[PDB]
Design a protein around this ligand. Sequence first.
Ligand code: MG
Lengths: 68, 552, 1340
Amino acid sequence: GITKASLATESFISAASFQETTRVLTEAAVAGKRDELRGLKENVIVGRLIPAGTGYAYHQDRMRRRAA
Amino acid sequence: VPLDGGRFATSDLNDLYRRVINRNNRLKRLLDLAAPDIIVRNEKRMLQEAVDALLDNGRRGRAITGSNKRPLKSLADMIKGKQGRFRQNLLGKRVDYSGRSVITVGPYLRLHQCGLPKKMALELFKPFIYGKLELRGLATTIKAAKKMVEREEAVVWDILDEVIREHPVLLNRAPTLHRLGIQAFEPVLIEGKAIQLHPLVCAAYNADFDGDQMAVHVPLTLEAQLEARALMMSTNNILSPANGEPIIVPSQDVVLGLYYMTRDCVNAKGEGMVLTGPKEAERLYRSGLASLHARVKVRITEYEKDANGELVAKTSLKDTTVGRAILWMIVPKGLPYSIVNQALGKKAISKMLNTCYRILGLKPTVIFADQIMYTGFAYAARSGASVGIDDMVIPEKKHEIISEAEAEVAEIQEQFQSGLVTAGERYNKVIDIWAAANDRVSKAMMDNLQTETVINRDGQEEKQVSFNSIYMMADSGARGSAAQIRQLAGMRGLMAKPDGSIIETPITANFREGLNVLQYFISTHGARKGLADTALKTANSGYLTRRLVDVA
Amino acid sequence: YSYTEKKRIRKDFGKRPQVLDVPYLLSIQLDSFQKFIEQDPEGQYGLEAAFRSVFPIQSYSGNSELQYVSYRLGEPVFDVQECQIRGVTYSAPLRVKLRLVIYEREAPEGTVKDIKEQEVYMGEIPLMTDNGTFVINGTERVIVSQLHRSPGVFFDSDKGKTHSSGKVLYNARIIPYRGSWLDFEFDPKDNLFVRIDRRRKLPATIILRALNYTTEQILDLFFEKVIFEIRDNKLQMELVPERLRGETASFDIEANGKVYVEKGRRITARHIRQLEKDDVKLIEVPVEYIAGKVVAKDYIDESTGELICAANMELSLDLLAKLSQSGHKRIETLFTNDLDHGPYISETLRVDPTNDRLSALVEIYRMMRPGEPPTREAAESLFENLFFSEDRYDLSAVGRMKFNRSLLREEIEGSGILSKDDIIDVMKKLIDIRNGKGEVDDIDHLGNRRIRSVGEMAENQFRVGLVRVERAVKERLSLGDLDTLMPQDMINAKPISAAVKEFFGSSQLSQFMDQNNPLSEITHKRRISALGPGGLTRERAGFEVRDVHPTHYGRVCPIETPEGPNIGLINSLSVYAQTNEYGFLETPYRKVTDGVVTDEIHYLSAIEEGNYVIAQANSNLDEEGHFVEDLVTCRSKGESSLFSRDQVDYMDVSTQQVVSVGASLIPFLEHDDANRALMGANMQRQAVPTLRADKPLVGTGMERAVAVDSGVTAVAKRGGVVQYVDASRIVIKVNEDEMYPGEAGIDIYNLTKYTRSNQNTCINQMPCVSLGEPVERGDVLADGPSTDLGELALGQNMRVAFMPWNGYNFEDSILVSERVVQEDRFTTIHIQELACVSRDTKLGPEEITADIPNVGEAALSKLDESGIVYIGAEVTGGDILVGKVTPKGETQLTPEEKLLRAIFGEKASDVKDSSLRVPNGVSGTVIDVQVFTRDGVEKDKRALEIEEMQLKQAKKDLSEELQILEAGLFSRIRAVLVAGGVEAEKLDKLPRDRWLELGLTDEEKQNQLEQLAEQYDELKHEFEKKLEAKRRKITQGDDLAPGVLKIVKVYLAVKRRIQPGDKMAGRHGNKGVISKINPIEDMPYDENGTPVDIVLNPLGVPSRMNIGQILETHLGMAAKGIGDKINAMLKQQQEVAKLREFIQRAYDLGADVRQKVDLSTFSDEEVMRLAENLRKGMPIATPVFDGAKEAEIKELLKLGDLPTSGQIRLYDGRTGEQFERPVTVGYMYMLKLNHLVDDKMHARSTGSYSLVTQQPLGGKAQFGGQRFGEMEVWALEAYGAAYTLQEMLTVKSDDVNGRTKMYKNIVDGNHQMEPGMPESFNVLLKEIRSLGINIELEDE
Ligand SMILES: [Mg+2]
């Protein structure tokens, strides 16, 4: 469902900001997760350009000047 | 932190941290005294429950409350919930360069512009005015400029008129259910305190002018200004993203004016003349020599796109009305005359705008939509289209339809007394013969409403579609359904109990007649149910939209 | 008719005669609080009941006791106006006589050593004012009544919402007034479960074993015994015939003759009836029939003694064979079948683990107090204090009544506590309902929901405070200080004060009074709330509690409820609805005895109402009272149907019985859709009082009732002659008929002049009367806000045209003429209070002064030498009202500004300007200044001159009232001196005062003369000490907050003219916002050149089916058309014969209307005064559901020489050409709502930020930012607006370094941002690390 699919994302920041913040932060803490900030919510939380729209070019050259 | 009256305000975390420290220091003390171990175990349990209340208050046991009998806000409550860090401070914020006011209508505006009060703009654009006052030498210092803007000298209004010039503002109406709830507009400085919204964008905002407020936001950077101009401007937002239908579309007054203009009367003044073009039709209408509905013969030149992008003309005498020829003057060139040679309701105008968009593109379409709005407003004004009590024409045979259904319900009641039917089929028969009588009253009312202009053509009577105002508002799609004309002029019909089960005696009255006390009470039964649904389903729809956004 | 009502008579179109007068509308509040504070000789109501509930207090000893004798409410220190000025509660001291009675140690009687009896002070009780409000901390508050669930037992179910099988599971709930809840319920397997305080469920037989019932006693309570009286053989069995109703035929029955029914045929009614024709008592049964039955007793042997078979064991061949060796004569057995007598109690005795009383008490203890090892004494006392202790459980008088009534008991009185019988009867009735012998309760029925009002909630909170002091008094009496203490040493007034202070100031039902207009106030006072302490929560209130129940008819308005999240949770009392002695709403009905509808009125509650057939009030009835019809429409059982005229028992007393007071004021409500009528009722009480009040031309006739039953008017207490009228006072010389002996006979009415309401509107009273005019008792003497000659006038009568005008009334916009603004029709006065508080700070005291740094002499132009603005000063935004400076220090100059002050030598200020300024955009007039100075602080010249003015005003007011009253006394003395022993010219020869020295011949004359002399001396010495009381209360110091040295309150009066953005509305839910103010030559105009005032859109009418706004328009054009005629006759100066004739024609019009106005009774001066009051339109009353019919509207249009179509030919003001169709022009009553665009418009570029997160603050009071919430962020993400979004998130709200860089970049003309991290993300990281969690940015 749209709640269990949005809580099962690979990003603990967006899942913790959606709902069930305690469960998400607990499983992410004991699993030692790492959030690469690839979606829109995680770049909104952290005050960045979103990877969509006019921030799509910025993220592309952020990832091709990191994979090089 | 000290409050204004010398009192202090504190966080609940200080209470929780103090409790943890106090129980920890007492545990250290007891371990120094070598207390009996029942006392040390108790202090360890208390330190554990204090640390638990600090981290998450209320998971294990009862929530610790402090000095209100209100539970203390723990560290976990700071970051979770609708009022946690994430949802209240990180996923949405309160912003600077933002104002708010009641919206009014400006029907003179162009689609890309809003009306912004000068008092609001002088505050929202204040560092821009400071910069342009220091730059133009009118102020020696940002404090001199600040005092100029406080005194509101005559030159800060010129500075303000040049700082807002090509600078869009975002206008937002809550709830922002979709992305057309934020649109960018070029401001026109007005003298009121109310924002003037273009009519054609109200359906995108779900806004009416009965007390709605909208927020204004100023894009600060050049990138934000160019996104407001290139992505969010209302002239980019004429199609819906949910479905490719036009969302900046005429409504209410515009479609009533365009419908009244494009209708035809049988013996209207100036019928049967032959006109050299739409300009002659406008001359004859304005000089009072022909009626807007006079069916007439006009030489119309219409352009069509060939296989190439070229626009080739054809000229012919069309059998049209004066008002359709007048409306043809605002239609862009690549469109056919059949797009206006009919009475234009809401659907026809929406399809006309969609046709203009697919054939000619966005620049002719925004000009066309503005011209359509101006023309529909003008000719709804010219019409004098009022609503009176004699417009709710009740069918003359409604009383006998109700008497016949009453006779049928009486004979079914006597059949139930005579044991021919049980209560179930008896009740269902009553419901059926009242729904049938309601459909009979509705058909009689609509038949007496929709064509009852009888009109003389060279002496002979003829039926035409009705120029009744209630009917014209319903038929144009401006306001009103047939289901509501039924309640005005027919009967209100069967009502449901709060259980959902139908009350077996309907409202045989309409709103033109009165409802009596009992009819009105059993109508409020369902009026409140609908209002409570509206009040309680916004939370469910917002929760579903939030789950959908967060999954996608 | 009156003197105030034949000034201007409203033409009534109602046709049904009024049998019951509309009651006093504020009886709910006043009656409830009177029951609270009055001296009840019995202990039933109020403070007496609360005192007797706890007293006598006896310690854990026999030595002493504290008993209660009496109570007394002292005089309030300040009256209600002084309390509003000083910001203090209007309350009365509660002085209670207590008696500390000391018994000596050892006697069989325990007689008294002594009694120390004296008066203790326990708390102040907030007093209710004359109009049903409380002044609490200076502001007027209303304690809203509460609709809560009545106490008693309620039988309910869930209908297939459990066990996934659609099985309905029943439950019973005993709800006390105070105590624990007791729930019985059925599980999906038909076992009965008890549940105490919503905790875990135990089997219901555990609470039966906690009571001393054995399993045998339980089984004889809940069952009836099949007897097998088995003879030597052949298994003889007792049988009554109705026990085999629907029985499965396990055997053929042969007795008193051979077989009636063979095998394979189940028993129908003919078999039972022929078997009882045979009168069969004893039947031979097979052995396999008893195998499976349940024995009802403990059968033990007499050979060995121990148990053969226990109670409630399924009997078999084996156990019957066992008892057969023991030779038992009779063996009992539970009679159970399916669907008529269930096994549930036995099947519950099989599931519980308990076998005796101790184990049951222990299981209850483990459920109530888990993890605590139960001892026998604690297990016994927990249960005995759960429901059977008077001090812990109260099923109150209403709860006992509803309990007994629900269990079909005869008596309605009882104990407040449960008994074995009560609990058994509840279980038996739940079992009945399970077995199909009952029906579940409707909990939304208004026989099940009860009204709890201020006088009861206040009593409950007082009893809470009384038990809080009772524990401490019982604790103090246990100490050996017992022979030297008085009762006022052990009484602490602070807990008792705290309980009532918390109720009156902090309850959810103690609400800031809605004071927009009179309708707002009486709607607030007649409000019922399901919310509150002991009620519902608006978040978990479902769809079914928010519904219009059929029992709401006549008791609760179905229309007036708010439209938001609490809809149907906040209700409004109906016009005639009153409350039972038990708290249940009742409504009045006319008794129909013989088909004749009597004028005898019975108030029926919702339980009683359903028993009878009740005819509507729309039912026609002839002169003798009989129905003219013989098949009447009625409500019998919550249904509605047609009945014969001999079946009806009652009739509605009015057509407006069903609606509230707010919906009673909407004309043609029956033609409005109910949603729009809801909106109109809600918006009528948001209307703002305008400069001049304008009666409705189309009203309903409830206007006088609303305006008088609110205290906004000055109403004549006694009739008389206006002796002196003046804008601030009315002085009535009372008629000799209404005077008491020994009295001046002068009523003085001091009018409220330009004070602010709770909503910052203006409260101003203007006299209606003229000098020398006769008044009767109950006449309106002065108009309040929004009343016009004693009629409620909420808006103005505007000439509307319904037509679309150039898009300016698009989508509910309103186009207003410029003449509406020139004529100040919707100009409203708003009064703001602004306080400047000078405090002690740590750096020194703040100082009110005119010497302000960095402020020129121009900005201190309207401040006096004390630094306070002058009264009458026209100020605007930014003007200093009170100049104040705060001492500061350690300026810590930057080196650049240090050099700056080295070059130009300018000293730095040791104080900072902390002045009180006018808020920006606000431009008013200073109308009042109050200075409150602390004791020990020296009053400045302004405080001294304000206090000198106050002292002269107190002395002047008192000497003026003494001059008036002594003039009245001496007029009475001169009248009684010429009444006998006439001195008619000698009295003017004598000096004025020494008429009191005239000994007169006393038949009765000298008695009256001497009591008049005594009254005069008492008036003089009453003035003399009221002067000193006033002087001491003026010159005394103020009890300011700690730290506060002085407060200066400035009062600004702001005239707000109407402007685009102001919300305007009609009474029919037709709200809208002004879009344009159009020049007069641009408005549409008729043949005579008269322009329209307001153009409304006709498209808002047919979809929002509020047709009553069209009819109100058509009638409003007719009403005005009468005035337009009368006006002409007054300008042509026609004779009074012609005016009298035309006005009689206008009042006689109508189809069998109930009112008769005969103008032949009127004198010519009275006719001319009436005609002068009718020249601006004849006002018209259109009762709800009894209103004007459309034919009568057309007849009145015809009388005023208007088109009966209601539609005229209009011309365009801009082009001069006709609109092509006729336009509905008329007069609608428009209202200006308190949603003014001056209060709404707010903008901000930068400002203050929050502490923890550094984001902008909230409101326009805080000069705050707009919430760019989550959905707006999604809207920007749906565009590609990544840079707009990034500057919303970082640089506009939280990025602290980036936002000042952004400001400097904007000022330098460089529109670029350097965005960093939001500060709330750093707060988030620090708060996740304050958990045990290492959250970290991977900085690679
Ligand atoms: Mg709205």
